Every structure is written in C-alpha cells, then in structure tokens.
C-alpha cells in the first residue's frame, strides 16, 4: 500500500463501528429496548382492557448497512431499529401509535421522546430510534412509517410510504468486494468529518443519511490494476477528491424571495420511496456553511496529494478529519 493509503486505512480502523451482525453489544442494547417495548405494551393495553398489538423488529440505519462510526468523546451511539406493529394504518392515528411506544418505555433508561419519524429512548452513551410502521398485509401491501409529533397539526400526522429495506439493499448492492469496502470506508470518512466540523443534533449537520445517499448517486471507485501483475491498489484520497468535487458540482444557487438573495443548495433524493430530498430541512445559511467546509475539505485532499512530506499531507487531512487521523512525525 502507498503511504497516504496506509494512513487512510488506519483512520478507517479507528473510526469504524462493527455492524449489528458483528457487534454483540449493539444487539444486546437493541434487544433490551425491544423487550421493554413488549413488557410495556402489556401494561399499557391491559390498563385499557385490550390485548397488546404485536410487532416484528428489523435492523435499520448504518448499523444494518455496515456504515457505522464510533462517536467522538461526548457523542452518542445511534441504534436504529424498525418495528412493524400488527395493525391497519387506516384504523389508527400515527402519533397515537407512537404514544403507545412512548408510554411502554416510560420508566426505561433516561425516558422516551416522540420525534417526527421515530420514538427515541435514551441510555448513557447511546439512543435507540424506533421507526414505527403499520402491517403492510393490513394496510394495502405498502409499508408506512408513523410521521408526526404530539405538538403537530392534522396535515403533519400521516402514514408515509417507506422503503428502509429497499435503501439497505441499494447501499449493499451498488458495488461488491473491495470496491464496496472503499465505498463504505468513504461514507465513514465523511461521517467523522461531519462529527468533527459540524454541531451534533443541529440541522446544520449534514445528516449521515444524506452523505450515504450522495455516495449512492456519485461515489466512484479509485483503484489501479498493474498491467503485468494485475495487483490492485486503492486510492481513498483520490476517491474522496472525486466524490467531494461531484457533490460540490451538484449544488445550485437558489434565489430566496423572502431574504432577496441566493443560497447554494444541494438536493439529494432518496433512491427508494418516498424519494424525498434528504437535505430539504437544511436552511440556506446551513447549506452555505456546508458547501464552504466541503470546499475546504476538497482543498485539503488536493493539498495532501502535492505535499513532499507524509507529515504535512496527514496534518492537512487531520485539520478536517480530526485528532484520530494519524500524523507521523517529520
Ligand atoms: N430522511 C430520512 C432519514 C432516515 N431515513 C431512514 O432511516 C434510517 C436511519 O436514519 P439515520 O439514523 O439518520 O441514518 P444512518 O444511515 O443510520 O446514518 P448515521 O450513521 O449518521 O446515523 C436511514 O438509514 C433510512 O433508511 C430515511 O429514509 N429518510
Ligand atoms: N424515514 C425515516 C425518517 C427518520 N427516521 C429516524 O429518525 C431520525 C431522523 O428524524 P428527522 O425526520 O430528521 O426529524 P425532524 O423532522 O427534525 O423531527 P423533530 O422536529 O421531532 O426532531 C433518524 O435518526 C432515524 O433513526 C427513520 O427511522 N425513518
Ligand atoms: Mg443512524
Ligand atoms: Mg437515528
């Protein structure tokens, strides 16, 4: 392996988090929550003199897709799980259904919170986000997620067509073998970049989902095959330079009539239902700051290439990737 490739592979080793299938801890913490949901629904529904609805859980998010990273000191693990309740969506309000889940987890961990798109339960060092779905068998074949907050109007409480497994398939299937490894490594690099240079639980923070979907559209492998030996070498720095430049190229200056100015906006559609712009909640100013840091990271990746000293090349990247990017002495 070439010098800088070695440093990127070490970085990847430091930031990577084992996926559900390879991580006893995540499964046990996930299962602790799923049990406290089953236990809690018995109490809730018996209280109401009915039988508890049942549910099928399924792994979701980066922990299901092998694109998870370790948080920086003071951050939390983000344990994503779907639950398919044995109900017909047309018999029930979506927020009422998320209320069941909230009520069931009342006393567990550090309390539960109905978010727009999940119920989140808190533990020291991690949160589980429960995406709550109706039975497609009882709901007309489509899998629909419970959207809405308690404090949200009729228009904003809906059952929306969802395809998390379709998304997981799309991320798993785009490439194979060492090509798909480089894709996953590069998604992780940008998640640590997000964590280092952006604010946690700030919309300003370009979501993992968005960088994942950007990679789906625009990631390109960077490798070389030796003409004579057929030996293959990967260039994660070059893969990241092409990918970041492509993202930057896809921003469009978008007039805002309210502010009487333009903001650069990057649109990234989910490639499965509901095909929404995953970055649609980011403001114009948050989009402006996103583009500027994306550009400074591009400028770093190019500078890294032309440095004579491994030390200076690695320092330029660590300015963007944080203190776990290895910097050898000069
Ligand atoms: N706007 C969104 C947000 C989330 N999801 C779905 O919910 C999952 C969990 O979302 P999130 O935890 O935000 O993303 P991850 O892909 O897990 O990324 P990260 O590692 O940064 O948490 C996504 O993978 C996706 O299947 C979605 O469809 N649309
Ligand atoms: N289709 C989706 C959308 C979101 N999520 C979960 O919810 C989170 C993203 O929520 P988001 O829609 O970005 O929240 P807001 O609309 O900002 O909601 P609120 O104002 O309640 O915070 C992710 O971590 C993921 O676990 C999901 O599982 N599936
Ligand atoms: Mg996640
Ligand atoms: Mg989450």
UniProtKB/TrEMBL annotation:
GTP 2 binds at residues 116-118, 133. DATP 1 binds at residues 62, 191, 194, 276. GO terms for molecular function: ATP binding; GTP binding; metal ion binding; nucleotidyltransferase activity. Mn(2+) binds at residues 78, 80, 129. It comes from Deinococcus wulumuqiensis. Keywords: Antiviral defense, ATP-binding, GTP-binding, Magnesium, Metal-binding, Nucleotide metabolism, Nucleotide-binding, Nucleotidyltransferase, Plasmid, Transferase. ATP 3 binds at residues 116-118, 149. CTP 2 binds at residues 62, 191, 194. UTP 2 binds at residues 60, 115-118, 149. InterPro entries: DncV-like_NTFase, NT_2-5OAS_ClassI-CCAase. ATP 2 binds at residues 80, 115-118. The keyword Metal-binding applies. Signal peptide: none annotated. ATP 1 binds at residues 62, 191, 194, 276. Transmembrane segments: none annotated. UTP 3 binds at residues 62, 191, 194, 209. DATP 2 binds at residues 116, 118, 147, 149. CTP 1 binds at residues 62, 163, 191, 194, 209, 273. UTP 1 binds at residues 60, 80, 116-118. GO terms for biological process: defense response to virus; nucleotide metabolic process. Mg(2+) binds at residues 78, 80, 129. Residues 58-133 form the Cyclic GMP-AMP synthase DncV-like nucleotidyltransferase domain. Pfam families: DncV-like_NTFase (PF21654). The keyword Nucleotide-binding applies. It catalyses: GTP + ATP = 3',3'-cGAMP + 2 diphosphate. CTP 3 binds at residues 80, 116-118, 129. This is Cyclic GMP-AMP synthase.
């Amino acid at each position: 392996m070439a010098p800088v490739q070695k440093q990127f592979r070490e970085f990847h080793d430091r930031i990577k988090l084992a996926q559900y299938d390879e991580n006893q801890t995540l499964r046990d913490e996930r299962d602790a929550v799923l049990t406290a949901v089953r236990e809690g629904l018995k109490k809730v529904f018996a209280d109401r003199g009915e039988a508890a609805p049942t549910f099928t859980p399924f792994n979701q998010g980066s922990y299901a897709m092998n694109t998870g990273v370790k948080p920086l000191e003071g951050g939390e693990y983000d344990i994503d799980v779907g639950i398919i309740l044995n109900i017909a969506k047309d018999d029930h309000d979506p927020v009422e259904v998320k209320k069941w889940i909230r009520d069931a987890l009342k006393d567990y961990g550090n309390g539960a919170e109905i978010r727009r798109s999940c119920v989140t339960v808190f533990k020291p060092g991690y949160h589980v986000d429960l995406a709550v779905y109706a039975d497609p068998e009882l709901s007309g074949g489509t899998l629909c997620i419970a959207k809405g907050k308690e404090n949200s109007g009729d228009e904003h409480r809906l059952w929306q067509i969802s395809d998390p497994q379709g998304f997981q398939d799309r991320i798993a299937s785009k490439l194979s073998g060492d090509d798909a490894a480089q894709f996953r490594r590069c998604i992780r690099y940008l998640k640590r970049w997000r964590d280092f240079r952006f604010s946690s639980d700030g919309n300003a923070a370009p979501l993992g989902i968005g960088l994942t979907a950007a990679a789906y559209w625009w990631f390109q492998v960077s490798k070389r095959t030796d003409p004579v030996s057929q030996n293959v070498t990967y260039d994660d720095r070059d893969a990241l330079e092409q990918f970041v430049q492509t993202m930057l190229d896809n921003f469009h200056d978008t007039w805002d009539s309210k502010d009487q100015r333009s903001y650069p906006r990057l649109t990234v559609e989910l490639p499965v239902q509901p095909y929404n712009d995953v970055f649609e909640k980011m403001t114009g100013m948050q989009m402006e700051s996103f583009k500027s840091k994306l550009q400074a990271l591009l400028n770093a990746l190019k500078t890294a290439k032309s440095r004579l000293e491994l030390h200076d090349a690695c320092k330029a990247l660590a300015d963007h990737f944080g203190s776990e990017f290895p910097v050898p002495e000069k």
